[PDB]
């Protein structure tokens, strides 16, 4: 009982940590996606100005 209890306890702790890491990856993908939208608009517009 003690064996599996402590094992499950630390494992649950790490599942929480994994959720946090998942969260920061989601945030960074949001940031990079916004930036790629902005720079996409910039490059398309500069090509239009070229033409």
């Amino acid at each position: 009982n003690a064996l599996l209890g402590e094992e499950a306890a630390t494992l649950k702790k790490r599942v929480d940590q994994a959720g946090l890491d998942l969260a920061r990856l989601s945030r960074i993908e949001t940031d990079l996606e916004a930036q790629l939208a902005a720079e996409r608009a910039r490059v398309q517009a500069v090509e239009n100005a070229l033409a």
Binding site: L3, E7, T10, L11
Partner: protein, 51 residues
Amino acid sequence: AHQADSGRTIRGLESQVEANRAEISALQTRLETATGRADKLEEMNGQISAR
């Protein structure tokens, strides 16, 4: 052509790197399990020696 070869090698090499990083976190899970196990078995082994 060179950019096409670059792309091929880039995503293949990225694939192997995420395989490696997955193994990192996963073997590191088993490591924390093992180390906590060893610690707490030490713990109650001492206690039950006192008993």
